Amino acid sequence: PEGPEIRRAADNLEAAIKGKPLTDVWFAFPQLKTYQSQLIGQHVTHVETRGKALLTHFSNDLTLYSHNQLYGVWRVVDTGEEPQTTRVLRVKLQTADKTILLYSASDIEMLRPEQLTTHPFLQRVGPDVLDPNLTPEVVKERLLSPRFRNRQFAGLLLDQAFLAGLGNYLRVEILWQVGLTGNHKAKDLNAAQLDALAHALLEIPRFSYATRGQVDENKHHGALFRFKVFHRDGEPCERCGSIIEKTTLPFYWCPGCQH
Ligand SMILES: [Mg+2]
Ligand SMILES: [Mg+2]
Ligand SMILES: [Zn+2]
Known part of the structure; x- marks a missing residue:
């Protein structure tokens, strides 16, 4: 489908924060702000790959859907660090030591378990x-x-x-x-x-x-x-x-x- 490439990104994210309690969660989109405090203390259980999309699963059953499309990119940094890239920050998932940041991507949505089955893209690629x-x-x-x-x-x-x-x-x-x-x-x-x-x-x-x-x-x-x-x-x-x-x-x- 795309080889390790797709599964590679998912693994990088898991390695960085899987199982670790989230100490800070930030989303640039207004419709996503409501999930921030709700996720504090929760953790990413795993990151599922779906075509060129990523499904970031949280321990409270919510799932962050992201498709980098043309410009999206995830970066792993040490908590506290502030990259000097000019890309626009869209998502910040922070743990005690590691923090992952999603820049530039536009296709970002928070899904409940029942919404996974009805998502247009997800229905097309298992x-x-x-x-x-x-x-x-x-x-x-x-x-x-x-x-x-x-x-x-x-x-x-x-x-x-x-x-x-x-x-x-x-x-x-x-x-x-x-x-x-x-x-x-x-x-x-x-x-x-x-x-x-x-x-x-x-x-x-x-x-x-x-x-x-x-x-x-x-x-x-x-x-x-x-x-x-x-x-x-x-x-x-x-x-x-x-x-x-x-x-x-x-x-x-x-x-x-x-x-
Ligand atoms: Mg031989
Ligand atoms: Mg038979
Ligand atoms: Zn036979």
């Missing part, structure tokens, strides 16, 4: 599977949410609105892992299957990412992560021996042990 904060429990929730619970996995696993960081190659491996064909929906699964699928949606993408070697390394060394059905059409399933199939109207799957 959480990233490589985000350490994204947990299987959160995944099962999205799968069961009225918005997705009735979508076929074949298309859902290719839709960034559900989860970002997925691709066809990951989609087919994930479904093979839980023995499902692309026509199923989260609403028809039992608790066991749902949990199984929720873990696979994260484990497989992370396993593939963490172990990919350099370019052309495959010429002398096979990767730790091996595809089971992707590009293996015509080969036997390692589980049941059936011949892996590929569609033509690509979904790869074992018709022998996936249904």
Whole structure:
């Protein structure tokens, strides 16, 4: 989607003030002033990435949404420090030692939990599977949410609105892992299957990412992560021996042990 770049900024912010009691909170926008005193003593629980946007979660359930767009930039300084940048300050989240400042950005809003689901931008891009904060429990929730619970996995696993960081190659491996064909929906699964699928949606993408070697390394060394059905059409399933199939109207799957 954008690589570490997007997740990099979120991590910088977390490292600086995650879990630390806020000693001062300031917002430039008039409609945001009302949340200032309310946040004193609270802390950022985590920073979620959503496309090129950041969702700064607070322990009181409020969430600060920010999209740098063209000029926004977050800076971490020592509490008390006053940068000499001419950029306009929009947000200041201060803790005892570290302070993070958002300059120039215009897309800044405070959201309650129920507003996250209805936010235009957020509806278009879901959480990233490589985000350490994204947990299987959160995944099962999205799968069961009225918005997705009735979508076929074949298309859902290719839709960034559900989860970002997925691709066809990951989609087919994930479904093979839980023995499902692309026509199923989260609403028809039992608790066991749902949990199984929720873990696979994260484990497989992370396993593939963490172990990919350099370019052309495959010429002398096979990767730790091996595809089971992707590009293996015509080969036997390692589980049941059936011949892996590929569609033509690509979904790869074992018709022998996936249904
Ligand atoms: Mg080597
Ligand atoms: Mg079935
Ligand atoms: Zn099989």
